[PDB]
Amino acid sequence: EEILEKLRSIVSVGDPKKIGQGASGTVYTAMDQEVAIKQMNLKELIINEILVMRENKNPNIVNYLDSYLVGDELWVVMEYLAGGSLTDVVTETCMDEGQIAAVCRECLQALEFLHSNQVIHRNIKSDNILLGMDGSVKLTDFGFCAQITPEQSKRSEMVGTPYWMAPEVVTRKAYGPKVDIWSLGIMAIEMIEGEPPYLNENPLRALYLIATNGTPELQNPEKLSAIFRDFLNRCLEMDVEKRGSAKELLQHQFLKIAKPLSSLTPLIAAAKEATKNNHG
């Protein structure tokens, strides 16, 4: 009806000329340069995702291309980043603080371009971090994003992935763009330990634990620099006022030891090889 008609007007009807799959729905790679195209069988959430990315292009954000659809079902074409996801790196390799810092910088820069444009991601995690072969870092999957306004600057709906969700979100309190900061802090734990806290627990158990403990403890804090140790706490602070911002954290001392983005290309190569080991 109405909402489908609005989406119909955004979608192009030109000339449309394989990752495999597939969660909601399936994602492929094709030839019409190398691209990535998703298929969903058919809503305002789709419209919001397409609009936010179409109207907020950035080198630190995976680039939108075009939109098509047959009868129902829908096609979103976007660029392809060949280095894969950060999840493949954090789960198969060890990152030094220099490499961990470099990633956080690119992510904080991607969060500063968003927070200043009244946009909260709300689903920051390593799975939603994609890598270029040159070690470039880009944010993806904005299906959970929420645009804020001068009149309404906060929200109260429970959205995101449990293990990366800030306490104020799981306790159904009002929150802002600093939930992307907590999620960044959890993603830093990924780059240290391989997993977010409580990953062995089921998602509901994790939520309960996040409400209880608040700030999560690292398995081996003594293996970290006092400057990295400081960066984490500035991300994982309970008080929203005390917790750092994308702009504020971009000027942190931990990001000065950031290695060149080229230093992430051996991590990528390792991830690629380890992805081959798991199959054979």
Ligand SMILES: CNc1ncc2cc(-c3ccc(-n4ccnc(C)c4=O)cc3Cl)c(=O)n(CCCN)c2n1
């Ligand atoms: C591996 N390189 C790589 N590089 C780029 C991508 C891009 C996407 C990707 C990301 C977002 C969208 N998108 C955009 C706007 N509105 C909607 C409804 C939508 O689905 C489509 C794709 Cl195809 C995508 O889904 N993947 C798959 C893994 C991340 N989800 C990608 N993988």
